[PDB]
Design a protein around this nucleic acid. Structure first.
Ligand code: MG
Lengths: 337, 26
RNA sequence: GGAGGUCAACAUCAAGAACUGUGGGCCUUUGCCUAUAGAACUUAUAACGAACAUGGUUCUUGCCUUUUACCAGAAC
């Protein structure tokens, strides 16, 4: 098996630059559960909360534009549409609510989940919604007629994170039974199963280019090729548990938010971890409240936005000095698995 | 008879493919 | 072949004050410019209805133990 270990010593992967802390934005009353960014102009955020609201923050200066109320309970997920001026928010109240960005009033309510719905993802080309939650089923909603067109029977437990892809498998799903399924929706059954995770897969992210996915677990962040469904790579992780979210820059940088408050940055190609940071909790907070609930990159990918459990949004910027003087991180030493 | 017993599982599913060559393009 | 029918089907009826076809020129089909022919029905104290109901969501109220049923304004 050593031949593989030599083949890990030839590459010397992929230098990148570190990250640092540009800006701190308070202003939520409760926790920040979810964050999404305007896919076109990059001019703002939509941030869920634990206070039921949604507060639309300006990306440029960080000022607060507007407040979108209307959920009775905490908002687990928010997703903004590309081709549409629509905003689909979803909560623990068992409802997926549409939002017309133009006039800022609820348009449609989609009905028929048994219990809280923790993920919405907007299929790129079909005018569909994909919702999922403690139902343990994935519902493909027809955006126009509010008809739960397709239901995907599936994982043996709740469904944490769901994504959409234009070609085959059009829905990737991740559940607390510690599997990740690659779905074929037209026939309505699993195309491929990926079991390699040992515990709940709490987050996924789609690489904007290579047509792959990064899947998470407690201590091990893996990657997966879509299409064939192979494993692609691994990412070197000592115990980071727990991984709340992942985000993939367009430069092939793979972010990992910790529940220990550590921000684990990776290269996507290699699996190498070139940086790990630690956030400052807050003025009056508790050391338990330091963690990262969600995160995203803008359309460019030169800034990072992380909602934290301390009731604050933080904006992490990529250092411009860097280069070879001293960037170098942990420097690519891998222990035998 | 080795073929029959575990016939489903096999090793190469455990091993990651990108570690051979990075930049292998999907 | 004319008159009709308390007959049917298929079109069309809210918009750059607005329709459609065609001739010619430029870009490279779209689109812009130019020329020409025909425009039923509905519209300016604005609309097919010289009339006039109900429902859904979201807010503001009003009754006020709670829910249907409700009180009277708004937006969609
Ligand atoms: Mg009761």
């Amino acid at each position: 098996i050593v031949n593989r270990y030599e083949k890990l010593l030839s590459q010397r992967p992929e230098w990148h630059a570190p990250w640092k802390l540009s800006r701190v934005i308070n202003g939520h009353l409760g926790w920040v559960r979810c964050v999404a960014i305007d896919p076109v102009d990059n001019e703002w955020f939509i941030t869920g909360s634990n206070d039921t609201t949604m507060k639309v923050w300006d990306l440029a200066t960080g000022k607060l534009k507007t407040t979108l109320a209307g959920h009775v309970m905490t908002v687990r997920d928010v997703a903004v549409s590309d081709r549409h001026p629509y905003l689909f928010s979803v909560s623990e109240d068992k409802t997926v609510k549409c939002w017309d960005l133009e006039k800022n009033q609820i348009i449609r309510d989609y009905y028929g989940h048994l219990s809280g719905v923790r993920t919405v993802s907007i299929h790129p080309t079909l005018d569909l919604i994909a919702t999922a939650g403690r139902d343990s089923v994935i519902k493909l909603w027809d955006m126009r007629t509010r008809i739960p067109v397709i239901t995907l029977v599936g994982h043996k437990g709740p469904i944490n994170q769901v994504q959409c892809t234009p070609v085959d498998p059009q829905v990737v799903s991740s559940s607390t039974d510690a599997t990740v399924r690659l779905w074929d929706v037209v026939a309505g059954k699993t195309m491929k199963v990926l079991t390699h995770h040992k515990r709940s897969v709490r987050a996924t992210a789609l690489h904007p280019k290579e047509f792959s996915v990064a899947s998470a677990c407690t201590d091990d962040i893996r990657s997966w090729g879509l299409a064939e469904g192979s494993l692609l790579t691994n990412f070197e992780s000592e115990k980071t548990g727990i991984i709340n979210t992942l985000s993939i820059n367009q430069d092939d940088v793979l972010f990992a938010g910790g529940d220990n408050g550590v921000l684990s940055f990776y290269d996507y190609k290699s699996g190498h971890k070139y940086q790990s940071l630690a956030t400052r909790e807050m003025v009056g907070s508790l050391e338990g409240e330091r963690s990262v609930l969600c995160s995203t990159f803008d359309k460019t990918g030169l800034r990072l936005i992380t909602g934290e459990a301390d009731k604050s949004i933080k904006i992490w910027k990529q250092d411009e000095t860097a280069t070879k003087e001293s960037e170098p991180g942990l420097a690519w030493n891998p222990n035998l698995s | 008879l080795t073929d029959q017993i575990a016939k489903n599982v096999k090793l190469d599913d455990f091993i990651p493919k990108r570690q051979s060559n990075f930049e292998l393009s999907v």
